[PDB]
């Protein structure tokens, strides 16, 4: 068994974490438990604290606007590791006991119970090179020696570890996505009717997505082209919540449906990161530092949860759009669009132990 360790720049205190990815179950999050090793001789009267912080960044690392930082702290939890506060009665995890046994008596535990309804680690890809700092939600564990909490804390006497709050695909599959639409343009005759569906609801990253499309063009109006697209929606909720849109994958077939006819087909679209490196602000899964990440996983939420979850909420839909070519007495080059939306879940399977 291995543990992750980091040390202060002066090397006095060092933080040990059993792992750096913490699974966020909908009901509760796995607690962040760890150990801090100090030396009471260095701390004449100082106290070492550990804080867990959920930081969301609005934009680029630069101030560049009036000298202010576009960085909110959505969640900050703090604990006084040393001296061991007699006030609390928190028990000791098995890994914490093993670390305290391994290290000396100068090893003191810390534990953080992350509350539910908090965002996971997502990073907004900025497309081309503009800044060296990523944009999105992150979780940070910060150990520091200080006389009191309200104090500017020295950078050589503090360790910071980036940890991960992750979610995995639900154990049980959900209902098969499906969508319907019945549309008539000038109400001449029986209308155009589009029906789309997916093969399943939960897909894994890299796995192809099959869209079964069925069109009954009962009117006299020809449809020329059919676009299937996989689109990522990033609800970046903040003060005055917004929503982001990005077409992640696309297949634009030139299949035509004659008037008063029928057309059934299956389109296979695979979303991958190779062709989405030029799209600024794309929700990526948010690794620890610059590393190999992928398109952000769908954020799972409770059925009766607070709709105003701060941070980035990721969703995925498949838009099936029939472009019906328009023209009557005067033949214009404009055309109408009949579209359906199929929501789906794009997640990582739970690791097998």
């Amino acid at each position, epitope marked *: 068994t*291995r543990v992750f360790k980091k040390a202060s720049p002066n090397g006095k205190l060092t933080v040990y974490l059993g792992k750096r990815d913490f699974v966020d179950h909908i009901d509760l999050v796995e607690p962040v438990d760890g150990v801090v090793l100090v030396d009471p001789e260095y701390l004449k009267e100082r106290r070492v604290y550990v804080t867990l912080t959920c930081a969301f960044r609005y934009g680029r690392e630069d101030l560049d606007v009036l000298g202010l930082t576009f960085r909110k702290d959505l969640f900050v939890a703090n604990v006084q590791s040393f001296p061991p506060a007699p006030e609390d009665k928190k028990p000791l995890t098995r890994l914490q006991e093993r670390l305290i046994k391994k290290l000396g008596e100068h090893a003191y535990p810390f534990t953080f119970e992350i509350p539910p309804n908090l965002p996971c680690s997502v990073t907004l890809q900025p497309g081309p090179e503009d800044t060296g700092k990523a944009c999105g939600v992150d979780y940070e564990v910060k150990a520091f020696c200080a006389e009191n909490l309200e104090e500017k804390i020295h950078k050589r006497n503090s360790v910071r570890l980036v940890i991960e709050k992750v979610q995995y695909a639900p154990e049980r599959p959900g209902p098969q996505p499906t969508a319907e639409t019945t549309r008539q343009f000038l109400m001449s005759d029986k209308p155009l009717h589009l029906e789309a569906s997916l093969d399943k609801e939960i897909y894994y990253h890299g796995e*192809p997505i099959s869209v079964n499309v069925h069109v009954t063009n009962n009117t006299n109006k020809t449809v020329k082209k059919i676009k299937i697209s996989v689109r990522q929606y990033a609800d970046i909720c903040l003060f005055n919540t917004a929503q982001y849109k990005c077409p992640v994958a696309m297949e634009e077939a030139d299949d035509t449906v004659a008037p008063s006819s029928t057309f059934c087909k299956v389109y296979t679209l*695979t979303p991958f990161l*190779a062709n989405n490196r030029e799209k600024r602000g794309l929700a990526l899964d948010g690794k620890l530092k610059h590393e190999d990440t992928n398109l952000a996983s769908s954020t799972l939420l409770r059925e009766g949860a607070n709709r105003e979850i701060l941070g980035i909420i990721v969703s995925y839909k498949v838009k099936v759009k029939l472009v019906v070519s328009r023209g009557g007495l005067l033949g214009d080059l404009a055309s109408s669009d009949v579209a359906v939306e199929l929501p789906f879940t794009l997640m*990582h399977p739970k690791p097998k132990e």
Partner: antibody
Framework: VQLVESGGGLVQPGGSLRLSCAAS????????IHWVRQAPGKGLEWVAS????????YYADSVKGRFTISADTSKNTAYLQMNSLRAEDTAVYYC?????????????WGQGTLVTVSS | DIQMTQSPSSLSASVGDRVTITCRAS??????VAWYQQKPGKAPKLLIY???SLYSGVPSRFSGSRSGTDFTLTISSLQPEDFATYYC?????????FGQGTKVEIKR
């Protein structure tokens, strides 16, 4: 669930080949494809690797510039073009697959094709 | 570039004996070490990954272990079908390097 290699045979030094690895049961975007060669009476030596999810492509320092690995994602096939074949390229070439997300070793391997560069 | 050294280069054991193969890494690969088994004329088969995790379907007699940069594959009760060449790959860094191989042979 299967990898099938083809395209190996007798060559002359300075010639070229094109090995194809057809992957059945695998998605080129949820898995990375590697080419690993074993010299006659020697150990395994990794040659090339392609990751279609990222478009990443890696080669060993002994084959850079000469060997190029590509993939036809529609057919789920991986190709290795070998140019300027030196006499030290005689080997058996296996196409192996690994998980794209959390690589956990080369789970699946093909039967391997013999490449002989004797003059 | 990491050189992985396997010991012994070849060993002769008998059915039921406990076989141990050692693999030393030049640099420090954290746990990205896999153990593979190749029989003559056949493609290699993954036996263990992450230096401890048994691959699906591999018999439980095979076990991996790590101590620092020193990894070990142990077969508890050697069987006649468990006599082949064993390789030690490290997939922490590019390129991925394999060991020279240990050929387990029968004892007479």
């Amino acid at each position: 669930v299967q990898l099938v290699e083809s395209g190996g045979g007798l060559v002359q030094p300075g010639g070229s080949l094109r090995l194809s690895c057809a992957a059945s049961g695998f998605n080129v975007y949820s898995s990375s494809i590697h080419w690993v060669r074993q010299a006659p009476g020697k150990g395994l030596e990794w040659v090339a690797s392609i990751s279609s999810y990222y478009g990443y492509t890696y080669y060993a320092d002994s084959v850079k510039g000469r060997f190029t690995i590509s993939a036809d994602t529609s057919k789920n096939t991986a190709y290795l073009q070998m140019n300027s074949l030196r006499a030290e390229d005689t080997a058996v070439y296996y196409c192996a697959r690994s998980r794209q997300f959390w690589y956990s070793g080369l789970d699946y391997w093909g039967q391997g094709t013999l490449v002989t560069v004797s003059s | 570039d990491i050189q992985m050294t396997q010991s012994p280069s070849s060993l002769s054991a008998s059915v039921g004996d406990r076989v141990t193969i050692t693999c030393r890494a030049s640099q420090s690969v954290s746990s990205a070490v896999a153990w593979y088994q190749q029989k003559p004329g056949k493609a290699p088969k993954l036996l263990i990954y992450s230096a401890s995790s048994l691959y699906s379907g591999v018999p439980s007699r095979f076990s991996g272990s790590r101590s620092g940069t020193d990894f070990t594959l142990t077969i508890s009760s050697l069987q006649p079908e468990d006599f082949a060449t064993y390789y030690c790959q490290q997939y922490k860094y590019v390129p991925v390097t394999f060991g020279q191989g240990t050929k387990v042979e029968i004892k007479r």
